Symmetry: D2
Subunit: 249 residues, 4 copies
């Protein structure tokens, strides 16, 4: 089908839990061979889950905070395999008023959210250019469009990956590489645990989401498959928000 990922090989970062894990499973169900990339061996679980369900997968363990090491691993893979799809999902958020953010903490967020996404995009994207086709989907955020509260480095980094998306689409679309972003709204995962623990804040958020409910990681799967599939072949340099109407509120 036009929505099929049969015959593709997809790398999905931060595949150990949350949105990444759901996308890894979803891609496998869609027919892709999945490289689940994670920071710890716990991603081997996911690879096993996929296998035990009839799917095709394997684990990659490499800490994206280590850019040099990440680049080595990605280049190895890009050369060793025909990777058709990259999903830049790994990300971290640090909540603290701007005045209190140390340079170290600012850089830590930017390293994983932006720099690593760049390193992987460059590595796998360069091989995609050589094969005449590929897709790269980066997980963005509501904070790719808005400032939020107490997450300045996060907001900067999430705006940044949208710039990276547009730049790479501009340069690479004509050579068969489709680069886009998927911006989740408010999703029930570990990254929002502290947020949801604040009853008042969580109620404020919920009241504002037009759909009236937070997302599950599964809500991100349909759109992630779409963006990696033939069905999105003329879609380039876009950010598709999956946010229950948040950006319209």
């Amino acid at each position: 089908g036009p929505f099929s990922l049969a015959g593709r090989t997809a790398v999905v970062t931060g595949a150990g839990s949350g949105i990444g894990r759901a996308i890894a499973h979803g891609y496998a169900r869609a027919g892709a061979h999945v490289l689940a990339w994670g920071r710890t061996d716990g991603v081997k679980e996911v690879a096993d889950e996929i296998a035990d369900g009839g799917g095709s997968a394997e684990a990659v363990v490499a800490d994206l905070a280590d850019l040099e090491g990440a680049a080595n691993v990605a280049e190895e893979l890009a050369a060793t395999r025909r990777v058709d799809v990259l999903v830049n999902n790994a990300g971290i958020i640090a909540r603290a008023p701007a005045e209190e953010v140390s340079l170290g903490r600012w850089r830590e967020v930017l390293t994983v959210n932006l720099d690593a996404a760049w390193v992987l995009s460059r590595s796998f994207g360069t091989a995609m250019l050589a094969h005449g086709s590929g897709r790269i989907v980066t997980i963005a955020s509501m904070l790719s469009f808005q400032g939020g509260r107490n997450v300045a480095a996060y907001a900067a980094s999430k705006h940044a990956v949208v710039g990276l998306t547009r730049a790479l689409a501009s340069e690479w679309a004509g050579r068969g590489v489709g680069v886009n972003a998927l911006a989740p709204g408010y999703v029930v995962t570990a990254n929002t645990a502290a947020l949801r623990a604040d009853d008042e804040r969580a109620a404020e958020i919920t009241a504002r989401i037009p759909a009236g409910r937070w997302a599950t990681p599964e809500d991100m799967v349909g759109p992630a498959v779409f963006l990696a599939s033939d069905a999105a072949s003329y879609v380039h340099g876009q950010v598709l928000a999956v946010d229950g109407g948040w950006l319209a509120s």
Copy 2:
């Protein structure tokens, strides 16, 4: 299926040619019963094509420039059927320097591009609210985001339908009606024949499109099906550009 329209009934306006015709066909292939709505009997041919192609379709003939008439037809269809999906595709464009635009010509563009989309959205949308479920997809444009040249009324109308998309999503998402837009880039259709008449203007446009080619109507089908399907159930109030990277250039 996550991307299936099996069991749905869809109304597609401007279904007689170009983008609407392609969407009508694609929706039928995805399992929808299609009500092909057009201004002339030409749309009966489309329903017939879909028919002996193995699909399910009927034709609706009604001039969207007649809003009172359009409302009557939409309301009756909404009351005698269960219409799950509406695609607002009918649109016209008038090219002329803004200084030369008569009020009548301004009005003619807004009536079809904006007012008619409103009347149909209100009519089918009201019934969707009662059924607890539905999707509305409006065909926007690059000129929903930029000014272009010699198309002031068109740009105004295409920004306006994005505003409408956002307003209805904000109001209706929480009641199960998913309202979104699809913004085509430059597409080979009767609507751009006058534009492409000038080979130099055409090539100038192509040079600017990152993908290096104009779209065909078929390029709009995958995204149109996605936005009407279960895979997009948390997508609300969004404008998905299908534009070969234009907006990123």
Copy 3:
């Protein structure tokens, strides 16, 4: 100075009260001769206020709901005077759930908010093109970017004037006519009386505005003068939001 409007003649619509009245006064203080355009004779008051303060002004009474009449008046003026600046401020908002909006009420909002702005822009803009310079500033809205609640026609119309702004800037910037928009956030005026009367809604809004306070009409003056002045001579087709940070929240 670069921020001076000395020697200019400015038309300001909806100048009888609120944002328009404050802009009329502000422009006069900046040195412009002001044509205060209103729906009723109450705008003669404003013209008198300006005069009694040492400024230069006069009243224009013409109901913008009457497009034909508006066009006659604007064309008369455009030919009779050297109008350097037009501020399209007149506007109406009608709050009601979308399902309940009649076609008549939809059209009423679009007529004043969009059609009239177009008629005046075309009339005065055409004369500006002939004189080799001019500015047009249209009052937009937060609902030029977002859907809001219970104001679908308003949102459509306010998105639309942003399209009109971009289109006219695209066509006319090179011939000396600077066309831009000013998008107010939440302002204490008659148009928000019903909103502010709802204690809970008003508190919701206030909590969301980062600056922590609603705007006064006076908050719009500095930006309106800026956009009409030599200081903004390379600013074209932009929407400057004056919103206390609303769009960043």
Copy 4:
């Protein structure tokens, strides 16, 4: 005066040439005491120009590529003065296809364009919060909104500073610190010399600019003064494009 900077102290980075130099001068003319911050002693010349031009200015020499050093300098200046305005203008650009971009070159761009703006904003901003008042204006770019060509790191960095602008505005507006950005279009400066080296590339750009001309650094001054003045006191979290209509084309 609504547009006066009389009695203010302003720090302008990259003040040695181009846009920064022009802003330094314009701020001085508007009555500000200017701290012209540059990487080399060249900026002492600027302070001297301002001086015998009748203005008030000092020079600060500090390489923004050295973030630990930049932080020390900014913190000391913030503690020993009352700095009312910060203009983050220092920026660099590196042109090269993304496939050819080394991690070091990527980092060099982000360090100056993003990280340094962060360090200074945090340093001066913290003191502004304590004084209950301040303005921060960051120089963004067209590539804060589009991908451009052969400038992936630059586009990422310029989107990022918009994210930062929005985050700080969201957090700080309610405490009297107005944080905004100014996005120049194509400007005749050393930063675009390599671009303009090719007369055909230059003319191609000009053809696309609605205003029909590239900007000069002086085109940025009026908007820069506006954003730092009382006239913009309700403007928060905004990016004002000064681009001859580029973004509308």
